[PDB]
Structures are given as structure tokens and as C-alpha cells.
């Protein structure tokens, strides 16, 4: 009697990052709330739900999912179907099913506020538990072997739950209800300290070593890192000597935003990036108090991160100083991920070790990011970001592997509407880096069920990535480097039309046998036209000039030597003769149009540096010292087949300023403004010719905050719609995404079968 129940059934599939986020317990709880019966389980394509009940209750259930999905979920699609009623008697979370699809994998996540409260609560049984996590935080990618996500397919598979954790797991009122990684002191991983004898707890042993000025190798989420007191001058010097990493700045971990603000300017948008559970290193302008010498000498920025694992919060209560965190490897080798590996490879580097017995399946570096010109500008996309895919507007024609470049390598694999760009792999410069690259390609193919049908690669035949591409038994598409930079940005912004592409970087292989890197293109995703570039200058020695930048300067001034007397006289007389003869005789000489080399020529000419320890160092120092000015240098654009600007004419005025006694800061500002001004002028010329109003800025020179912001502002004020990289780097870390979407566009055209 009364209202007759009307029972309906719906099948619901949810796609995206929808596993390892506590979606199963969430669904269970809202299904109970709305008196629905049925089942939920992880399948190979995401999340599968069957619910039966009143239509009104099903609708409210769906609305709850849409309105407040789990915190770590990144839902891309929800499918809802009417199905027949089975007369389920209850609602249950059931076993996972492998049905042959594929599903995205969550990045590793920083400790949530609930776990942090429990960690610091002396009455909680997880008080000071170094591996505390829950459905809303902790390692994911780093410990996942396979999908559908479940404890048995993670390195927690060798840590069976104790009776207490199992009770929590099976208790619908517990916040760890069906939490796949649930563990505790009794059943979970443990720390292991190796050094000298210490009778204190492991974290305290680490704190003491750090206070004594020693180097600690710490097993973290993505691999090992080496730490020292960032206020300790000699400790930092010792770390640099032992790692053999002498120039590149060190990132530092600080306890909280309050501490960071003592050393850095922190905007609200930068504060948001720091505090994100993604927990990257964020590049921040220095202000106020100073860290030790040898952290970031001659730069105006510091790379800062906050604690991201429970061990960091524990360590922070024991020390009163920020710490260097640099990856645990000898310079130029992949980050160590295994205990045995670390103890062997870091034996002459670290003084003591903080190990643990939770296997790292997939090693991954810290991410490096920033906020500039109204958006996040990522530099190194790794822990906390990768392996989250870039969303494509349309499903792909077929799966493509894009092999990436040489510097800062990533590869990218497409499937469905995702571009799975890999985490940062590193400079593909040696056998160890290459072996690691190769293994990551195999692991991403397995993890995401990708079987590449076509391989995309750079035109540069010397990249190990290119050699790898050619080694495969697949059709190949070659992609010009600068075209790929522009396409990487187009991909993020769903652009698929001809844009004005400003591709500024150090070196990319051009189609005319020369080095490119200061190019203006008109391109879409399937072609490019080169419209403008810098007048080619000889670069004697090729790889030698990368680090001996006075050689780059000599190349830029080769045909007007007598003008730069003071500079040329500083070069050793015999070496000078040889360099000039080599240029003249075309011995080991490349011809370059390059914003990176232009920057190096300026830095050398005004005596910033004559030699550099790492690629781009001189350009970073030049940017860091710049003054506040609107002044700039005269330039000339000559139009023949293409528009060309001669950088040497600008170098003449720079050297004139230098001889007169102008401050380096002022000269740098004038130089930066000149590049902005001529680039703007070229863009306007091109718009007048073509009607094109979209401008894309990419290539590693746009890591320069000033160039990027000023050009975006100036172009925007003149009506352009301006785009630059945000989710992937404008440096070579982003190249694989551009290669992927270019090759994909070609596949769907008439010029491919
Ligand atoms: N102030 C700053 N500005 C720009 N980049 C910074 C920075 N501080 C740190 N970084 C970057 O953050 C990254 C930290 O990584 P590390 O592990 O310390 C060295 P790496 O580049 O991976 O090579 P290596 O491990 O082979 O020596 C480096 O690329 C470094 O240049
Ligand atoms: N702050 C900066 N200002 C100006 N140029 C920079 C800055 N940082 C890096 N660059 C330039 O960008 C280059 C890196 O460009 P990428 O596109 O990553 C590598 P490639 O030049 O091989 O294509 C560096 O070698 C340097 O020449
Ligand atoms: Fe590049
Ligand atoms: Mg490193
Ligand atoms: Zn948590
Ligand atoms: Zn337990």
C-alpha cells in the first residue's frame, strides 16, 4: 500500500584519471545514501557502475558524481545507459575486470591535510608513521605495475594488511574504506638508516648527519635525492665536488610558505603552485634573506619546493634550515631508484642513506615549474604531473610514438583522445640515459596498452632518438624541430589552423643544412613555411662553441673583427688565429640562425662569462642581471626571399655601449627589448600580408621570463591572440607532443595511407 516503487537500472562508465582516487568507496557511499543497489568495479578502461533504484535517486547519485567527484580524479567522460533490472539485493564493490581497454594513471601526490593531521597526532596509531597515505594522497604512478589499479598491482602487493588495517579497509564509516594502499607501522614499509652507528630513530639519524654538514641520500617517491643544509657553504661545495655538478643551480626544500617568503617573492599564483599536491619545485625571484654560496650564484631566482612525503614533514621538525634536494646520481646519469643501486652508485657521494623497502617501480624526477604572464609555465614535467595525459579534441587516427629530441628528452604516445607524454627522461647523451629511455618506452607501451603504428622523429639524424625511430619496423614521419615546438603549444590550446609561429631556441636542425633557432614560421599541424630568421653566422668547432662561448661571439663578429678590439685582444693570440682561419677555410664550421647563440654572443661580448659549465648558463645570467629600461637598439629587416635580421649590427651597438662604460644590467635590458621589438615588428608585417592573428611562442629561449611576458603583452596590446606553452615545456621537453600531433594530422590527410 502507498506509492508503488518504480525500479530502473543504469550502467555508468567513467573515464579519465578515475582509479586510485577512492572512486570505488565514494560510489559505494553515495549509492547507499540514495538507496541504490548494484555494483561498482575498476575495469581496464576506467570505472564501471551498475545502479538500480528510483529514477530520482539515480539522478541525485549521478549529480553527486558530476558535482563533487574525488579530489584526485580527472574525469574526461561519463557515459550513462538504460539497462534492464537484475534485482540486485544490495550494493557492493566487486573485483576488478580486465576487458582489454586502457586507462590513464594518476600522478604521485603530496600528503593530504587529513593524513598530515593524523601524522602529527600523538594519540593516532599512525603518529609519525613515515608512509602514511590514503585514497586522496601518496605515490601512484611510481608504485603501479599494471592496471586496473588495485593493491595487488602495486609494490604494496608484498605488504599484506594487518588485522587492524583490514578492519579499516572493510569499515564503510572509516575514511580508509577500500583504500588500496592502506598500511601502518605493523604491516607497512619501514625506513632503514645506513651510515655510522646511531641509536636514535632513523629520521633523527638523518637530521644529525645534515647538522654535521654531511650529504644524505634519501629514498623518496620517485627515486633517491641528495640533501645537505642549504645554509651550509662547505656542505654545498662538497656536494658539488662529489656529484661533479659545478654550475647548475640546486633546488631547495623549505618547510612552508612562510619560510619561502623569507628568501623569495611569492605571488598568490606561485603560492598555489607550491602548495598543490603535485608539489613541484617552483622558480621564484630572490628577495630578502640569502641561502649559502653555491646554491644559485649569479641567478636572480631560486628553485623551491615544499615537503611532499611524510618523511619530509618528520625531518622538518628535527632541523631548522632548508635543504638542497638534487637527484641521487652521478652527474648526467638517470636518478637511482633501487636501494642496491643507490648504495653502489652514490658510495663516494653520500655520507649516509635513508632507505626503505617499498619498491619504486617507475622512477620519476621532481617537476620544475613557474608562473609567468598569466599562466603556469612548466620547465620540467615530471613527478606530480606525468603521466597525466594531454587531452586531445578528437580521437587519433592510429597510435603514434613520437621519440622526442636530444636535450631534456621526453617521448609521447597517442591513444584514443590522449597524448601520453612521458615524464622527463633527460639529455639523451650517453648509453645509460639511452637504456633508461628505451625501458621507459617499453613500460609506457605496456602500462597504457600502446602498440605504435607510426613513429615520428626529428629531422636531425644524429639524435639517439632519431636512430631509435629508424631502428623500428614502422612507417616514419620526420618533423622539423621548430615546427614541433610550435605544434606542442598548438596541441595544448587545441589549435588546428595556420598560426604565426615564433620558435626561438639554441639549436635545431634546419632543412637547409644549417642550424635554426631564431625562426618565424607560418604553420599549421601539417606544414610550415619559413618566413623570417637571423642572418646566418659561422660557428667554429660546433660542439666546442656551446661551452667556449667567446668562440660563438667570434663567429658572430667574424667579418667585422677590427671593430671589437678590446674583446678580441683578450683572446689568446694563437687560438684566435686558428679560430678565424677555421671559419675562413670552413673547417668544422656550422652556420646558425639561433636566439640561444645570439644570447651567448652578447654575454661573452659584455664580459658576463667567456666559458659556461652547462648549455644556456650564459643566457640565464644575462637575464638575471637585467635592469629596468624601455630603451633598445636599432635593427634593420631585409626582405628578399625571406625577412632577415643581421644580429652583428645589433652587437655593434651593444659593444659601443660597453666601451662607453654602460652597466651590464642596462645593456642586457636594451638587448632583451630589441629582440621583443623586432619580433613584434615581424609578426605585424606577417599579419598585414596574411591576415593571421594567432601567434604561438615556443622554443627554449621562451624560458626567459622577460622575453615571454613582454612579447605576449606587446602583441596582445596590438590585437593578436597569443599562445605559449603551459602544460608541457617550451624547451625540448615539449618537442614530442608537437611531433605527435603533426604526425597525427598528416595521417588523417590525403597524403598518407
Ligand atoms: N633557480 C633556478 N632556475 C632555473 N632552474 C633551476 C633553478 N634551481 C634549480 N633549477 C633546475 O632544477 C633542476 C634540478 O635537478 P638536479 O637533479 O639538481 C640536476 P639535473 O639537471 O637533473 O642533472 P644531473 O642530476 O645530471 O646533475 C635542474 O635542471 C636545475 O637547473
Ligand atoms: N633564460 C633564458 N634566456 C634566453 N635564452 C635561454 C634561457 N634559458 C635557456 N635559453 C636558451 O634555450 C636553449 C634551450 O632550447 P631548447 O629548445 O630546450 C634545446 P635546442 O636549443 O637544442 O632546441 C638554451 O640552450 C639557451 O640557448
Ligand atoms: Fe628546441
Ligand atoms: Mg638530476
Ligand atoms: Zn592522505
Ligand atoms: Zn596495518
DSSP 86-131: ---SSEEE---B--S-----PPPBPPPHHHHHHHT-TTSTTTT-TT
Question: How far is it, in rounded angstroms, from Cα 65 to Cα 125?
Answer: 32
Identify the nearest ligand to the CA of 326 by its number.
Answer: 1
Q: What is the DSSP annotation of 316-381?
A: HTT-SS-EE-EESSSTTSPPP-SHHHHHHHTTTT-SEEEEESS--SS--PPPEE-EETTEE--SB-
Cell of 560: 667585422
Closest atom of ligand 1 to CA, residue 248 = 31
DSSP run (H or E) holding 400: strand 400-402
Query: How many residues are recorded in the chain?
Result: 753
CB 436 within 8 A of CB 425: yes
Cβ contact 464:494 at 8 Å: no
CA 118 from centre of chain:
31
Which residues of 54-90 form beta strands (DSSP E)?
Answer: 74-83
Ligand 2 pocket, residues with Cβ under 6 angstroms: 407-408, 505-508, 517, 596, 599, 615-616, 619-620, 623, 699-701, 703-704, 731-732
Q: Of the candidates 721, 719, 722, 700, which has an alpha carbon nearest to the alpha carbon of residue 709?
A: 722
- DSSP 8-class letter at 422: P
Topology of domain 252-306+361-380 in CATH is Translation Initiation Factor IF3 (3.30.110)
Among all ligands shown, which has an atom nearest to the Cα of 432?
Answer: 1
Q: How many whole angstroms separate alpha carbon 216 and alpha carbon 225?
A: 8
For ligand 1, atom 24, the nearest C-alpha belongs to: 331
Is 128 catalytic? The answer is: no
Return the biggest CA–CA distance within the chain: 107
Annotated ligand binding at 412? The verdict is no
Residue whose CA is at the smallest distance from ligand 2 atom 5: 701
Cis peptide before 499 (omega within 30 of 0): no
* Top mutation candidate among 368, 372, 377, 618 for ligand 1, by most atoms within 8 Å of CB: 368
Superfamily of domain covering 481-729:
ATPase, nucleotide binding domain (3.30.420.40)
Q: In what order do the strands lie in the sheet with 368-369?
A: 323-324, 252-253, 301-305, 281-285, 368-369
Contact (CB, 8 A) for 516 and 496: no
With the most atoms of ligand 1 within 8 angstroms of its CB, the residue from 228, 303, 323, 381 to mutate is: 303
DSSP H stretches of helix in 625-728: 647-660, 664-690, 705-717
* 461 vs 159: CA distance, rounded Å: 47
Angle at 221 between CA 219 and CA 223, to 5 degrees: 55
On whether 134 is known to bind a ligand per the annotation, the reply is yes
Q: Which of 3, 10, 42, 380 is catalytic?
A: 42
Out of 3.90.870.50, 2.60.40.10, 3.40.50.620, 3.40.50.800, the CATH code matching 1-251+307-360 is 3.90.870.50
Tell me whether residue 578 is exposed, middle or buried, using C-beta atoms within 10 angstroms of its C-beta: 0 to 12, 13 to 18, 19 or more.
middle
DSSP string, 381-392: --TTTTTPPEEP
d(CA 416, CA 303) in angstroms, rounded, equals: 36
Ligand 2 atom with least separation from CA of 729? 18
211 ligand 1 Cβ < 6 A: no
Residue 732 CA, closest ligand 2 atom number: 18
For residue 499, give the DSSP letter. E
CATH 3.30.420.360 assigned to 381-480+730-748? yes
Give yes or no for residue 744 CB within 6 A of ligand 1.
Answer: no
What are residue 500's DSSP bridge partners? 522, 695
List Cα–Cα distances, 372 to 285, 347, 596, 703, in angstroms.
Answer: 11, 40, 20, 10
CA atoms within 13 A on the CB side of 349: 27
Out of 10, 24, 358, 597, the active site residue is 24
- Residue 121, number of CB atoms within 10 A of its CB: 12
For ligand 2, atom 21, the nearest C-alpha belongs to 506
Q: Do domains 381-480+730-748 and 481-729 have the same CATH topology?
A: yes
27 C-alpha to center of ligand 3: Å?
45
Place of cell 622554443: 699
* Active-site residue flag, 245: no
Decide the pairing of beta strands 37-43 and 91-93.
parallel
Ligand nearest to the CA of 281: 1
Q: In what order do the strands lie in the sheet with 224-227?
A: 191-194, 352-356, 216-219, 224-227, 326-327
List the chain domain ranges: 1-251+307-360, 252-306+361-380, 381-480+730-748, 481-729
Q: Number of helices and strands (H, E) in the chain?
A: 23, 32
Please give the distance, rounded to the nearest whole angstrom, from the Cα atom of residue 313 to the centre of ligand 5.
14
Closest CA to 311 of 193, 215, 423: 193
All cell numbers assigned to 352: 649516509
The partner residues of 528 in beta bridges, in order of sequence, read 523
CA distance 9 to 87: 9
Q: Are strands 499-509 and 537-540 parallel, antiparallel or unpaired?
A: unpaired
Q: Backbone phi, then psi, for 313, in 5-degree steps? A: -60, -40
Distance 700 CA to ligand 3 centre (A): 6
Backbone angles phi, psi at 351, to 5 degrees: -85, -40
Q: Which ligand is nearest to the CA of 332?
A: 1
Amino acid at each position: 500500500r502507498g506509492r508503488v516503487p518504480q525500479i530502473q537500472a543504469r550502467q555508468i562508465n567513467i573515464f579519465g584519471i578515475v582509479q586510485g582516487v577512492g572512486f570505488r568507496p565514494f560510489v559505494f557511499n553515495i549509492a547507499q545514501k540514495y538507496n541504490l543497489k548494484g555494483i561498482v568495479y575498476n575495469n581496464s578502461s576506467g570505472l564501471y557502475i551498475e545502479v538500480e533504484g528510483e529514477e530520482k535517486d539515480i539522478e541525485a547519485f549521478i549529480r553527486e558524481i558530476k558535482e563533487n567527484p574525488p579530489s584526485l580524479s580527472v574525469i574526461d567522460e561519463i557515459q550513462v545507459r538504460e539497462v534492464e533490472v537484475k534485482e540486485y539485493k544490495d550494493f557492493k564493490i566487486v573485483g576488478s575486470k580486465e576487458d582489454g581497454g586502457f586507462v590513464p594513471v594518476s600522478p604521485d601526490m603530496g600528503v593530504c591535510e587529513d593524513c598530515l593531521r593524523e601524522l602529527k597526532d600523538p594519540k593516532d596509531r599512525r603518529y609519525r608513521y613515515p608512509f602514511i597515505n590514503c585514497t586522496n594522497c601518496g605515490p601512484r604512478f611510481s608504485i603501479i605495475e599494471d592496471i586496473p589499479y588495485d593493491r595487488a598491482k602495486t609494490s604494496m602487493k608484498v605488504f599484506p594488511m594487518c588485522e587492524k588495517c583490514s578492519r579499516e579497509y572493510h569499515d564503510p564509516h572509516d575514511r580508509r574504506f577500500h583504500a588500496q594502499p592502506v598500511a601502518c607501522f605493523d604491516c607497512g614499509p619501514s625506513l632503514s638508516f645506513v651510515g655510522e652507528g646511531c641509536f636514535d630513530d632513523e629520521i633523527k639519524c638523518v637530521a644529525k648527519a645534515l647538522k654535521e654538514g654531511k650529504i644524505v641520500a634519501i629514498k623518496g617517491i620517485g627515486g633517491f635525492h641528495l640533501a645537505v643544509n642549504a645554509l651550509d657553504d662547505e656542505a654545498v661545495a662538497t656536494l658539488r665536488r662529489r656529484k661533479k655538478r659545478y654550475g647548475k643551480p640546486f633546488a631547495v626544500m623549505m618547510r612552508d610558505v612562510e619560510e619561502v617568503k623569507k628568501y623569495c617573492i611569492v605571488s598568490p599564483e606561485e603560492e598555489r603552485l607550491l602548495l598543490s599536491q603535485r608539489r613541484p619545485i617552483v622558480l621564484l625571484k630572490k628577495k630578502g634573506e640569502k641561502l649559502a654560496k653555491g646554491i644559485a650564484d649569479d641567478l636572480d631566482t631560486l628553485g623551491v619546493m615544499l615537503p611532499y612525503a611524510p618523511i619530509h614533514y618528520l625531518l622538518m621538525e628535527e632541523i631548522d634550515f632548508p635543504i638542497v634536494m638534487t637527484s641521487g646520481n652521478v652527474s648526467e646519469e638517470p636518478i637511482c631508484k633501487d636501494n642496491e643501486e643507490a648504495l653502489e652508485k652514490l658510495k663516494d657521494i653520500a655520507d649516509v642513506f635513508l632507505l626503505n623497502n617499498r619498491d619504486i617501480v617507475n622512477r620519476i624526477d621532481d617537476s620544475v615549474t613557474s608562473f609567468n604572464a598569466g599562466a603556469e609555465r612548466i620547465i620540467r614535467r615530471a613527478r606530480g604531473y606525468a603521466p597525466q595525459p594531454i587531452l586531445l579534441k578528437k580521437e587519433v587516427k592510429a597510435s603514434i610514438l613520437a621519440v622526442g629530441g636530444f636535450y631534456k628528452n621526453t617521448f609521447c604516445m597517442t591513444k584514443g583522445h590522449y597524448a601520453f607524454i612521458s615524464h622527463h627522461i633527460g639529455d639523451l647523451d650517453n648509453e645509460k640515459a639511452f637504456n633508461y629511455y628505451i625501458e621507459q618506452i617499453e613500460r609506457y607501451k605496456k602500462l597504457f596498452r600502446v602498440d605504435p603504428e607510426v613513429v615520428a622523429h626529428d629531422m636531425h639524424k644524429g639524435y639517439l632518438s632519431t636512430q631509435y625511430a629508424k631502428s623500428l619496423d614502422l612507417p616514419k614521419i620526420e618533423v622539423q624541430h621548430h615546427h614541433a615546438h610550435i605544434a606542442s603549444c598548438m596541441a595544448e590550446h587545441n589549435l588546428d589552423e595556420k598560426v604565426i609561429g615564433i620558435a626561438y631556441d639554441g639549436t635545431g636542425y634546419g632543412t637547409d643544412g644549417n642550424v635554426w633557432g631564431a625562426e618565424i614560421l607560418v604553420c599549421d599541424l601539417k606544414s610550415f613555411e619559413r618566413i623570417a630568421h637571423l642572418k646566418y653566422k659561422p660557428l667554429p668547432g660546433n660542439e666546442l662553441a656551446i661551452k667556449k662561448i667567446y668562440r660563438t661571439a667570434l663567429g658572430f663578429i667574424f667579418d667585422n673583427i677590427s671593430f671589437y678590439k678590446n674583446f678580441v685582444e683578450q683572446v689568446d693570440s694563437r687560438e684566435l688565429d686558428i679560430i678565424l682561419k677555421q671559419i675562413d677555410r670552413k673547417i668544422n664550421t656550422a652556420y646558425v640562425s639561433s636566439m640561444g647563440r645570439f644570447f651567448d654572443a652578447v654575454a661573452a661580448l659584455i664580459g658576463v662569462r667567456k666559458e659556461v659549465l652547462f648549455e644556456g648558463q650564459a643566457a640565464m645570467e644575462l637575464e638575471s642581471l637585467m635592469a629596468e629600461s624601455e630603451e633598445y637598439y636599432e635593427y634593420e629587416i631585409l626582405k628578399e626571399d625571406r625577412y632577415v635580421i643581421d644580429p652583428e649590427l645589433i652587437l655593434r651597438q651593444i659593444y659601443e655601449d660597453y666601451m662607453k662604460g654602460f652597466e651590464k644590467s642596462y645593456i642586457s635590458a636594451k638587448f632583451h627589448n630589441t629582440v621583443v621589438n623586432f619580433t613584434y615588428d615581424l609578426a605585424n608585417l606577417i599579419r598585414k600580408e596574411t591576415g593571421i592573428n594567432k601567434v604561438v611562442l615556443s622554443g627554449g629561449s621562451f624560458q626567459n621570463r622577460y622575453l615571454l611576458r613582454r612579447l605576449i603583452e606587446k602583441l596582445s596590446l596590438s590585437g593578436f591572440e597569443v599562445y605559449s606553452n603551459s602544460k608541457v615545456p617550451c624547451n625540448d621537453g615539449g618537442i614530442s607532443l608537437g611531433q605527435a600531433v603533426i604526425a597525427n594530422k598528416i595521417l588523417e590527410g590525403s597524403a598518407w595511407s
